[PDB]
Amino acid sequence: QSAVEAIKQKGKLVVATSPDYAPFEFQSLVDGKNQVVGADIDMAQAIADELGVKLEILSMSFDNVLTSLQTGKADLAVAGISATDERKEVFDFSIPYYENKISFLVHKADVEKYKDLTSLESANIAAQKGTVPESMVKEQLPKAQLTSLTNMGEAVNELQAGKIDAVHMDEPVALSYAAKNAGLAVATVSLKMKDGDANAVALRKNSDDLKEVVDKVIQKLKDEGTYQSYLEKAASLTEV
Numbered sequence: 200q201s202a203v204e205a206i207k208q209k210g211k212l213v214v215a216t217s218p219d220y221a222p223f224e225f226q227s228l229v230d231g232k233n234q235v236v237g238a239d240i241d242m243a244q245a246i247a248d249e250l251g252v253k254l255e256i257l258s259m260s261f262d263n264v265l266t267s268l269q270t271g272k273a274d275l276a277v278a279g280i281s282a283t284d285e286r287k288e289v290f291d292f293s294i295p296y297y298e299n300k301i302s303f304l305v306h307k308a309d310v311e312k313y314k315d316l317t318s319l320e321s322a323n324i325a326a327q328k329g330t331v332p333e334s335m336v337k338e339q340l341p342k343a344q345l346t347s348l349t350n351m352g353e354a355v356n357e358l359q360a361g362k363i364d365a366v367h368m369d370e371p372v373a374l375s376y377a378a379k380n381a382g383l384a385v386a387t388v389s390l391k392m393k394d395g396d397a398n399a400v401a402l403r404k405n406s407d408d409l410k411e412v413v414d415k416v417i418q419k420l421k422d423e424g425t426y427q428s429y430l431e432k433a434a435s436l437t438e439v
């Protein structure tokens with residue numbers, strides 16, 4: 200019943216994430232290779248340090264992140280998770296740690312084309328299974344051809360192969376792909392987005408002791424400009 204005590208006793212904070220989402224979380228060559236890195240990971244490390252424990256990153260696909268939290272495979276879920284009303288029926292969320300827009304990644308040659316909703320409606324769109332960007336397309340563009348894919352890298356791969364024309368994703372991720380790759384760009388078209396649905400850490404309900412610690416760390420990071428600095432550090436790093 201006491202999250203903070205259980206965490207101290209097992210000597211680790213277990214954080215479920217989906218590392219297909221630079222600059223939030225992704226894989227990098229770090230003193231060797233195969234390391235999960237990113238702004239969410241730095242923030243999780245800050246939470247583990249506050250609790251005086253080791254950080255364990257449990258990687259999985261995004262549509263299983265909240266499921267694993269719900270069933271006790273993780274203490275927290277940190278994966279650029281939008282704090283929605285519907286999600287708040289099942290989970291508690293920390294205060295927001297970062298707020299951003301949702302945009303489309305397209306080929307550079309198509310940037311002049313994909314400027315409105317009308318252009319997307321006949322295009323082949325992809326979004327990640329179990330995400331807010333996926334729901335927005337389903338809800339606002341129900342006659343667009345939507346392919347839902349488990350892994351975000353796989354969606355961008357289909358974009359590059361030309362099977363997909365546009366990929367809906369959090370803007371910092373689209374900006375990262377566009378910056379790291381010559382023939383990709385962020386489109387100007389955007390769908391209607393919900394106010395205050397920002398990124399937050401998810402917890403199981405009645406985890407108030409642990410929520411307080413997570414909130415304290417997040418507040419300090421926001422007050423020091425540190426989450427923003429984490430994202431900029433991440434954008435310097437090389438994906439794998």
Ligand SMILES: NC(=[NH2+])NCCC[C@H](N)C(=O)O
Pocket residue numbers: 216217218219220223224261278279280281282327329330331332351369
């Ligand atoms: N690591 C990831 N793939 N994260 C996807 C997050 C997508 C969106 N922000 C959501 O909460 O549904």
Ligand SMILES: [Cl-]
Pocket residue numbers: 377383384385
């Ligand atoms: Cl761009």
